[PDB]
Point group: none
Chain length 72, copies 2
Amino acid sequence: MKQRITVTVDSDSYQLLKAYDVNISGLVSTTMQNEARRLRAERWKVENQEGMVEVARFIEMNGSFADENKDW
Amino acid sequence: MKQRITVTVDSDSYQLLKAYDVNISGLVSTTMQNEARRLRAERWKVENQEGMVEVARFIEMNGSFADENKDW
């Protein structure tokens, strides 16, 4: 069978991601796999932060691109 | 008005999170806000499946506690 899990966004941030990469629906269940794997009843944290992205800072920014071709 | 993002999981990991924390739908859009600001998603889904969490016995179930638990 299947389970329809739907977060009615438009107001929530979902739109932002899909607004620039409407490839999250799958992500939804993916973001869980991570929170799922790590899921094991007991879970600590307190304070975690080291490297941020790598071990200094990298990432790549092109500027400001939406995600639509529009009409022309 | 609103946008219905429906990731019919049941098979996907979504269920894994709701199975032990059915507090993701709203979360979905949250994970986006972070992936929205930073707008730097990633591509790395699953490869194959297992089809056996353990190996002993696990016939059709209806539920009892949490969502898919037994006792503790």
